[PDB]
Each structure stands twice: as structure tokens, then as C-alpha cells.
Enzyme design. Sequence first.
Site, mmCIF file in Angstrom:
data_model
loop_
_atom_site.group_PDB
_atom_site.id
_atom_site.type_symbol
_atom_site.label_atom_id
_atom_site.label_comp_id
_atom_site.label_asym_id
_atom_site.label_seq_id
_atom_site.Cartn_x
_atom_site.Cartn_y
_atom_site.Cartn_z
ATOM 1 C CG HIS A 41 -1.817 1.227 1.301
ATOM 2 N ND1 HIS A 41 -3.041 1.278 0.683
ATOM 3 C CD2 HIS A 41 -1.686 2.386 1.971
ATOM 4 C CE1 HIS A 41 -3.643 2.446 0.946
ATOM 5 N NE2 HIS A 41 -2.807 3.151 1.733
ATOM 6 C CE1 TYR A 75 -3.682 4.408 -6.425
ATOM 7 C CE2 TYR A 75 -2.059 2.665 -6.674
ATOM 8 C CZ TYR A 75 -3.280 3.213 -6.980
ATOM 9 O OH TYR A 75 -4.102 2.549 -7.871
ATOM 10 C CD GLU A 97 -7.905 -2.119 -7.861
ATOM 11 O OE1 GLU A 97 -8.820 -2.586 -8.568
ATOM 12 O OE2 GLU A 97 -7.681 -0.897 -7.715
HETATM 13 N N1 LIG Z 1 -4.225 3.898 8.995
HETATM 14 C C1 LIG Z 1 -4.769 3.986 7.774
HETATM 15 N N2 LIG Z 1 -5.568 2.982 7.326
HETATM 16 C C2 LIG Z 1 -6.059 3.080 6.079
HETATM 17 N N3 LIG Z 1 -5.822 4.021 5.157
HETATM 18 C C3 LIG Z 1 -4.986 4.983 5.651
HETATM 19 C C4 LIG Z 1 -4.423 4.991 6.892
HETATM 20 N N4 LIG Z 1 -3.613 6.097 7.037
HETATM 21 C C5 LIG Z 1 -3.687 6.736 5.914
HETATM 22 N N5 LIG Z 1 -4.490 6.120 4.983
HETATM 23 C C6 LIG Z 1 -4.789 6.619 3.638
HETATM 24 O O1 LIG Z 1 -6.203 6.839 3.642
HETATM 25 C C7 LIG Z 1 -6.779 6.504 2.355
HETATM 26 C C8 LIG Z 1 -7.750 5.304 2.325
HETATM 27 O O2 LIG Z 1 -7.114 4.050 2.548
HETATM 28 C C9 LIG Z 1 -5.544 6.210 1.485
HETATM 29 O O3 LIG Z 1 -4.908 7.412 1.004
HETATM 30 P P1 LIG Z 1 -5.513 8.377 -0.149
HETATM 31 O O4 LIG Z 1 -4.553 9.468 -0.288
HETATM 32 O O5 LIG Z 1 -6.937 8.720 0.118
HETATM 33 O O6 LIG Z 1 -5.414 7.435 -1.487
HETATM 34 C C10 LIG Z 1 -5.800 7.975 -2.772
HETATM 35 C C11 LIG Z 1 -6.479 6.849 -3.542
HETATM 36 O O7 LIG Z 1 -5.493 5.877 -3.824
HETATM 37 C C12 LIG Z 1 -6.011 4.576 -3.559
HETATM 38 N N6 LIG Z 1 -4.822 3.732 -3.285
HETATM 39 C C13 LIG Z 1 -3.853 4.120 -2.408
HETATM 40 C C14 LIG Z 1 -2.752 3.399 -2.192
HETATM 41 C C15 LIG Z 1 -2.597 2.091 -2.755
HETATM 42 O O8 LIG Z 1 -1.603 1.376 -2.703
HETATM 43 N N7 LIG Z 1 -3.592 1.771 -3.705
HETATM 44 C C16 LIG Z 1 -4.699 2.545 -3.916
HETATM 45 O O9 LIG Z 1 -5.562 2.208 -4.759
HETATM 46 C C17 LIG Z 1 -6.875 4.804 -2.378
HETATM 47 O O10 LIG Z 1 -7.847 3.722 -2.191
HETATM 48 C C18 LIG Z 1 -7.546 6.145 -2.688
HETATM 49 O O11 LIG Z 1 -8.686 5.965 -3.533
HETATM 50 P P2 LIG Z 1 -9.931 7.011 -3.484
HETATM 51 O O12 LIG Z 1 -9.186 8.373 -3.516
HETATM 52 O O13 LIG Z 1 -10.647 6.806 -4.757
HETATM 53 O O14 LIG Z 1 -10.698 6.891 -2.218
HETATM 54 C C19 LIG Z 1 -4.515 5.689 2.474
HETATM 55 O O15 LIG Z 1 -3.100 5.678 2.105
HETATM 56 CL CL LIG Z 2 -2.926 8.743 -5.098
#
Ligand SMILES: Nc1ncnc2c1ncn2[C@@H]1O[C@H](CO)[C@@H](OP(=O)(O)OC[C@H]2O[C@@H](n3ccc(=O)[nH]c3=O)[C@H](O)[C@@H]2OP(=O)(O)O)[C@H]1O
Ligand SMILES: [Cl-]
EC number: 2.4.2.36
Length: 520
Positions: A21, A65, A148
Site C-alpha cells: 500500500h 500512490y 489490485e
Molecule cells: N491507517 C490507515 N488505514 C487506512 N488508510 C490509511 C491509513 N492512514 C492513511 N491512509 C490513507 O487513507 C486513504 C484510504 O485508505 C488512502 O490514502 P488516499 O490518499 O486517500 O489514497 C488515494 C487513492 O489511492 C487509492 N490507493 C492508495 C494506495 C494504494 O496502494 N492503492 C490505492 O488504490 C486509495 O484507495 C484512494 O482511492 P480514493 O481516492 O478513490 O478513495 C490511504 O493511504
Molecule cells: Cl494517489
Amino acid sequence: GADDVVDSSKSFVMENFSSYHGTKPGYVDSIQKGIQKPKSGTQGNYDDDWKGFYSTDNKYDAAGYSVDNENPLSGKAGGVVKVTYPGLTKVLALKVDNAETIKKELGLSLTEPLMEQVGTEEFIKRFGDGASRVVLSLPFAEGSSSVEYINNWEQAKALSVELEINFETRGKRGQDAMYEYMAQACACINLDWDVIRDKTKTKIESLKEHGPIKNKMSESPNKTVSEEKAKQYLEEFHQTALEHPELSELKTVTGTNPVFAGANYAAWAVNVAQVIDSETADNLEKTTAALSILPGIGSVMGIADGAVHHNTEEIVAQSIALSSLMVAQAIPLVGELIGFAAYNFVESIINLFQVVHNSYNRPAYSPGHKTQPFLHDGYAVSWNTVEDSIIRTGFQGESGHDIKITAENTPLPIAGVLLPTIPGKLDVNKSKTHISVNGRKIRMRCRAIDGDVTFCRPKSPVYVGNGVHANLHVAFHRSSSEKIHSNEISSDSIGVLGYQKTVDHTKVNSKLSLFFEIKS
Ligand SMILES: Nc1ncnc2c1ncn2[C@@H]1O[C@H](CO)[C@@H](OP(=O)(O)OC[C@H]2O[C@@H](n3ccc(=O)[nH]c3=O)[C@H](O)[C@@H]2OP(=O)(O)O)[C@H]1O
Ligand SMILES: [Cl-]
Ligand SMILES: [Cl-]
Ligand SMILES: [Cl-]
Ligand SMILES: [Cl-]
């Protein structure tokens, strides 16, 4: 039934199932204390069916990401964490990414979100094959062999979180650490940008003390002159500087390809001075936004005919130094701003080299157009398949549409895309809409514009060219049961915006359009 939407060959139960992630700055430490749904935000998706925690099998894709959402082009990168489920996890691979179809075919509730149901005890007994929880998997992107993973939010609380890499700990400039990491994927071009930065300063300083160059400087109008005059002077300046000791490698190669000619360096410098105003010059993120939509960057990067010719620190530094010097000369002639040229210009352009090098370090996405393309300003755009060009009037849930985007030779930017909507009934899923460049998946920032059109801009710079091809994936969401009529939509095309150019003494973006067919 399940065999309608599940790929059994990609579905399995594994102990200590792990995945990666990408994490933003400010969260690399806190995420290791546990995965938890944020109180607000899209919590994984625009579409409630797809809300969950997202991961991937590929740590380099996860890294994509990790950049600060407030400054997506030039901002800091956070890091990558590895998330592991204790015990047994079922990976359930899907053959479609349509939630309504999946809920229908798996005999789920049609009135509860798919990913919510995935974490229920009943679902897990039905589809878990003995595992403690189920994770859905989908192909990551066109042009990629990555996966994914979509995790139910409550089940994801069971995850153990470890650090894979924290980019900030490296204490490097710009996005260098993130891009060095991604280059491990390949090995391949993997330049040391710290060395290139220093060579660039040393070469700049070298050039400013050169007799014939500073004399050439003395000849500049040092005042607002026309573009013609400006370009002419700058071509002369280039010829002059290219004779200099420290640019000797550059001179040799320069005659070798028309892309590298002085006229092209001069056009670039002119265009830069034209678009960088005071506010922009004072802000790296704005600078990078502006530079990223210009044509001709292949000249300074020495990229042409499907290859990266400027593939050593020394010659990249020579090229960057010369361009920087020229940008400084152009600013009084046509710009309006001291110090941008050797700082933010250099830091911004380094970031764009990094982007394009990262694309060339990846396998070239399926180069041939599979339907007849639309050709314009060096770009070629086509529907991936005929079906992608059709919006089925009775579609349920959502619909995905793929468009191939290439350019004929040097790297040309894609500034954004123009997507049609229908008031309520048909909306852009802003989470699942993206552009994949040789399998690098780039998220979008989308906003409504006039005429039932949504404009989406890529988060990171998009370039296509010989050897660098993209897939635009448009994800529509059906927000209303009410049927859609073939004459209901205001717009019937998808627009692709290319490089910025001048028309009627005005800056506009190159535009290409593909037309949709709406039918049952
Ligand atoms: N303790 C925590 N537990 C969970 N999440 C946390 C935590 N702390 C921070 N986060 C962040 O909170 C969001 C939801 O998980 C993610 O970041 P984002 O910037 O919104 O992440 C931006 C977007 O990237 C996607 N994405 C991110 C990284 C990845 O490897 N793949 C992917 O598809 C996310 O789902 C998100 O989608 P949406 O914007 O469409 O919701 C994540 O990194
Ligand atoms: Cl992103
Ligand atoms: Cl894709
Ligand atoms: Cl680390
Ligand atoms: Cl145009």
C-alpha cells in the site's frame, strides 16, 4: 453463478497473505499502527460498492500512490507499507469490475454495497474455502501484469503493517528517492540526479564566464521583443555555447538528430519564458504544471525515435545546463520575471525527465491501434475495441471504456480529458477513471465544466511518444435506474487535450475527440 464472474485460476487461499500500500507523507508512521477506514473522504472509492482498503502485489505500483495530494506533481513521496493478514485469506479474482453484475451473479443483496457484503460472515463462509476473510482481486491496469486487491474495511483491521520504504528518510531532493526506487523494477536508465544537479551548476557557471558567450549576452535586446527576434537570438546563443568545452559531448550528438537542434532548444526556451509568470516562478508545483503541458521537451531530454539518447549524467547535465542558460536569456525577451532559470526550472525539468525515463524503463504498452485512430498534432487516439465506443443504454451499475493514446515520435503531454455526463443518471466514477502509461496507473482529479462535461487532469505528468503508450480508462457510474435515451446526452464525444500552443495570440490546448455511439 460464481463461475460467471470468478476466475478460479487466479483465486486461492494463502497463509500470511501479504500485499503493498502506497502511503502519503504524514501517514508512514501512523499507518503501521493499523489499517482503519478514515472518518471521511471517499474511503477507497467514489462508488459505495467499491469502498474499501486498496493494495497491490507490486510495491513499485504501490509507490505510485505515495505523493502528497496537495502537490501531486512536485510534492514529497511518503512511502510503501506491507500489509499481511494472519491466518488464511481467500483471494477471489474477478472477471469483471462491475459491482451490480458481481452482486447479481454471486447472489448477493442488490441493495447493500458489494465490498460491505464481502466482509460478512455469510460471504466468507460461502466463498472463503475455509479462510478467515476474503479479498477481491482485479487486474491492476492495461499494460501491467500487477494485481489490485480490494479489502473489506472491517476485515482489514486484522492486517499487520510493516514498513517497506520511507522515501523521506532518504533525505533526497524532489521525488528522487521515489523514482530511484521505481527504477529497481527495471534493473534501464537510472541516473544519479544528485550528480546531475551538481554537474549542471558547474556547467552553468562555466558557461557564464565564457568570453564569446557573455559577449553574445551583451548583444541581447534585454527587452520585450517579438517571438521571432527572441528565437533568432536564442538560436545564435545556442550555436555559440555549443562550441564550449564543457558541452563537447552535446555538440557531437547534436547534428545526429533533428530533434536536438538549436532551433528546438530556442523554441523551448521561448515557450517557457512565455508561460512562466511571477506567481508561477515562485512555486515549484505551478512551474511543473506549466512546463508539463509544453511541446518539444524531447529536444532537451534527447529523446527521439523510441529511444533515450541522453542516457548519461554528463550529457543530461550538459543539455539541462544549456537549456537553463537559454531560459534565462529568454525571460527578458518574452517572459516577465531572478533565479527561476537555475533553480525551479531545473528542479521542475528534472522531475519531468524522471517521469519520462520511468516510462521508457517500462515495457511498451500494446503499440498498435486496434481500431482506426484519429490523428492530430502528432497524437493518435483510438477506441481500444468497437465496444468501448458504445454506451449501452440499458447498462447496469457501471461501464468502462478504454481509449489508446500514442504519439508519433518525441514525448508529447496529455493535459487532461473531457468526459460526457447525463444529469444524475450517468456520472464519471472519479476513482476508477485513470490513465495507464506503459502500465503505470495514474489517478485523476476531475471537475464539472460547461455542458454536462467532466474534465479530468492526471495527478502526475502524462507523456506519450514512440515507445510510450497509454490507456485512458473511463469509468461511468449509473446513479439512476431511469433509462437513458440516445438523444438525452448533451455531449457525445470524449475529448483528449494535448500540448499547449498559441492560436490567435492565445494559449490553448491541442484537442482530439472520439465519438460515442449510444445504443441498446
Ligand atoms: N491507517 C490507515 N488505514 C487506512 N488508510 C490509511 C491509513 N492512514 C492513511 N491512509 C490513507 O487513507 C486513504 C484510504 O485508505 C488512502 O490514502 P488516499 O490518499 O486517500 O489514497 C488515494 C487513492 O489511492 C487509492 N490507493 C492508495 C494506495 C494504494 O496502494 N492503492 C490505492 O488504490 C486509495 O484507495 C484512494 O482511492 P480514493 O481516492 O478513490 O478513495 C490511504 O493511504
Ligand atoms: Cl494517489
Ligand atoms: Cl488501464
Ligand atoms: Cl526506509
Ligand atoms: Cl487543436
